[PDB]
A paper describes a structure:
However, while the structure of FliC has been determined previously, the structure of FljB remained unknown. In order to map the identified ɛ-N-methyl-lysine residues to the structure of both flagellins, we determined the crystal structure of FljB. The tertiary structure of FljB resembles, similar to FliC, a boomerang-shape with one arm formed by the D1 domain and the other formed by D2 and D318. Interestingly, the methylated lysine residues are primarily located in the surface-exposed D2 and D3 domains of both flagellins. Notably,  except for two lysines in FliC and three in FljB, the detected lysine residues were methylated only in the presence of the methylase FliB and most of the lysines conserved between both flagellins were methylated. Further, we found that a single flagellin molecule can contain up to 16 (FliC) or 18 (FljB) surface-exposed methylation sites. Deleting the D3 domain also removes the majority of methylated lysines and, interestingly, FliC∆D3 and FljB∆D3 strongly affected invasion of MODE-K epithelial cells.
We show that both flagellins of Salmonella enterica serovar Typhimurium, FliC and FljB, are methylated at surface-exposed lysine residues by FliB.
Residue numbers in the entry: 54 to 459
The structure:
Amino acid sequence: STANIKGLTQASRNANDGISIAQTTEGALNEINNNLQRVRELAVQSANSTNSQSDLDSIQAEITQRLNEIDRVSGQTQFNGVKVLAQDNTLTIQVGANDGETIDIDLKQINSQTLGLDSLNVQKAYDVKDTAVTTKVYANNGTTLDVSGLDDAAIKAATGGTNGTASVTGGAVKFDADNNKYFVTIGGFTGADAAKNGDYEVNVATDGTVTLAAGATKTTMPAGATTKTEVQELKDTPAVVSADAKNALIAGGVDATDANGAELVKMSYTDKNGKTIEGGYALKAGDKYYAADYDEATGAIKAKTTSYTAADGTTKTAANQLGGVDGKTEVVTIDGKTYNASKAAGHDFKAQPELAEAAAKTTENPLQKIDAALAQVDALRSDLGAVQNRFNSAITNLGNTVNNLS
């Protein structure tokens, strides 16, 4: 009789834990349901051709936030340490005084993947274009600097000296990039004209022709000066892609030949109506675009890459390609599968072989899919409510049995 009384009484405390498990799980499933209803409403809103890709991009961002919130609740909700929505798990609770007098609680893994929505996407592809990044650098042209005319008579005519035989020292000319100027050193004057020996600015015709202007007077050769033998002229030069940028791409799985011929570009994205907006910078290798940072002031280029632990256990990196459904999403390709860069970061494919792949296209019949998920959640909520009634009825029956024994 004592065994029974103490056993039934403890069995009743056990039943209360079943009820707690059930309420903790229901609470969380209620929150998941709220997030799913918002997702459904957002899908209805996206099914409107008046929406621009910018609009859809905004709706998608919010859908992704809701889905992530669902994965948060699913992964962290707990009762005495049990992650009730994290795995399929049949919990058995003894509700009688003897072995086997139990009620099972069938917990199920409920997350965006098991609900069939981790690839849910309402975006549309942008028309992707690019513009080569250049710089302005002074170069030449076969137009040599002709200073043969600036002879003794010409130098005398411009400076007013008469003593000695003056000449362009070394027949050399110096160039200042800062102001597209030219300079020469004059020597040879003697007597009181010796003071005219020094440096003078000269004018270069849109031809070799170098000349000294009347009234000319020696100045100070501008620092930064440098000898040029042909006419200087500014022409666009493709931004230089560094070895470490190329090597970062290769380390990141980009083909060696393609990476070696990488080109810095500025992205552009045009929508279905024809409107175009500028994107960020990227390294175009082969026919693919890999996101990159670019310091206009320095020319320093930094290839964006994602680090992670491969299935073989080692640490590797993947180049962040511009792709995904919209065409401007940072994705990575690892061992036969494509993932969103942000999701693969820090991931351990050895410890967790499974990671959701990036959406490859716009979702077809999204509402049918969101509705299926809502039905899965309602089905689990119903079952939990019924098992809650079974625990409650057990508590009632245990209470009476104990009453009569005592």
